Amino acid sequence: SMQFTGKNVLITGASKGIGAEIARTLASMGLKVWINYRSNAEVADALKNELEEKGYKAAVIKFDAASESDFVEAIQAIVQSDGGLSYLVNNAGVVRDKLAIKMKTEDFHHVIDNNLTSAFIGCREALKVMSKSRFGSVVNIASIIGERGNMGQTNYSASKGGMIAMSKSFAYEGALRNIRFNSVTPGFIETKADYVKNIPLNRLGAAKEVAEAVAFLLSDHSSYITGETLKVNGGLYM
């Protein structure tokens, strides 16, 4: 388990996969978890029901994390409901990999607009709602690795590298108010043998293993860590 001075967390794109397990993990550690979804509510509702049945604190909130006004209003609604917001996990990325010569700038815009602007809005609003309290932690999570090998990832890498650098800039901006910003870069996550081939630990990662890395960066245990990128990839990249 891990220690948290803060009380609640918003997780964008939290209905399924890594996002849902982040919600599950953080709720089991005692945080009230806010499960963001954009379109179909049924999976998010089922997650919220599951977590409450397990004795945890959970709520759902519908909004498009790539929409400035929708995200801003959602955080205002959480602050109204809970009194504040301690923690934020930006996980609303999309993946659409193509060879660059086959990719329209529309396709590139699609991925970058969504992945970078969503993380930008969340980080910006975290500075606003976290600063008075002199306390906060924000984790920016990159997309799971798409294919085997190194092709088709020009908009994936643009998104991921942009996120990591912009997170460092937020780390400077939040530092005096003790608002930390860190990134997590997952490897191949089970969410076969040919993939496991190049992974030193000789297995795909579990979603829970990524979620516990996120939990560490949110937790009090990482209080002197900001502007860092934590790789969770079984040794695939060092």
Binding site: V95, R96, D97, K98, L99, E147, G152
Partner: protein
């Protein structure tokens, strides 16, 4: 059923350099997945080698989407 689809989906995804989620039954090799001329030949030869079949050129030209080739492969490979 699904096992053959997964198996074929993986070949298509690596051949055409797309993430698997794009390779749905309704996805068209050219229109949606961006296969060019060399890609089509390369993909045909890879599936022919994988499954031990040989597709008539005229019938290859009528495989427009992923479901079409999965159906062709169930019908024609050896049990």
């Amino acid at each position: 059923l699904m096992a053959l689809f997964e198996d074929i989906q993986a070949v298509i995804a690596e051949q055409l350099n797309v993430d698997a989620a794009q390779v749905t039954p309704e996805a068209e090799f050219v229109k949606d997945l961006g296969a060019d001329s060399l890609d089509v030949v390369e993909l045909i030869m890879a599936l022919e080698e994988k499954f031990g079949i040989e597709i008539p050129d005229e019938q290859a030209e009528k495989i427009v989407n992923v479901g079409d080739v999965v159906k062709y492969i169930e019908d024609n490979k050896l049990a």
